[PDB]
Amino acid sequence: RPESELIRQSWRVVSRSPLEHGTVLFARLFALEPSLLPLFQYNGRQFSSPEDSLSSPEFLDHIRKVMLVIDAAVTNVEDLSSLEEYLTSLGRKHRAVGVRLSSFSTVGESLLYMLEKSLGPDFTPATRTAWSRLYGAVVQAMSRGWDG
Numbered sequence: 001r002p003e004s005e006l007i008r009q010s011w012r013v014v015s016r017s018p019l020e021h022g023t024v025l026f027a028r029l030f031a032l033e034p035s036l037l038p039l040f041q042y043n044g045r046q047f048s049s050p051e052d053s054l055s056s057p058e059f060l061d062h063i064r065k066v067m068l069v070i071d072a073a074v075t076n077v078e079d080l081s082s083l084e085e086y087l088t089s090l091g092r093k094h095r096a097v098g099v100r101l102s103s104f105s106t107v108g109e110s111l112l113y114m115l116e117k118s119l120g121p122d123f124t125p126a127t128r129t130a131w132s133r134l135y136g137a138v139v140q141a142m143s144r145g146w147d148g
């Protein structure tokens with residue numbers, strides 16, 4: 001595909017500083033859906049404000065985990081059926097922690113935001129479409145973890 005190449009190329013820019021980019025993703029996410037903040041409970045405590053999350057080593061480790069899963073999806077963009085079982089279990093895990101499946105579309109929008117701000121004029125409508133499709137396929141796999 002041409003789509004798969006637009007993904008690979010766009011990601012190369014982002015994957016050189018994944019925490020920096022990931023931080024954009026989550027900052028945006030909390031700006032859109034502040035009700036997600038209490039779901040990151042480390043040591044039984046909740047963050048009061050979004051900026052509190054950015055000082056947590058464990059939250060930052062979750063950003064790195066996120067970025068690594070997306071990297072896995074990109075690496076496998078030609079065939080994502082190889083990550084399907086893993087993504088399904090990742091979905092189950094997030095169900096357990098309290099994440100609503102609908103929140104994953106906000107995460108999608110946050111990812112697109114982060115790509116748009118990183119790439120600027122290189123973020124073409126076809127790049128966006130490609131990434132929407134990829135992210136969509138990831139969430140489809142993960143959604144099996146809400147058994148459906």
Ligand code: HEM
Pocket residue numbers: 036039040041058061062065066067069070090093094097099103104107
């Ligand atoms: C939508 C909001 C999200 C919330 C609120 C959230 C929250 C959490 C929490 C609480 C954990 C367990 C603690 C931890 O490992 O840090 C976790 C684990 C994880 N999250 Fe997320 N997460 C979200 C989205 C994502 C997304 C989009 C991805 C990947 C694309 C991701 C990948 C992971 C991974 C890889 C783990 C480790 C799971 C394991 O193997 O045990 N998360 N997440």
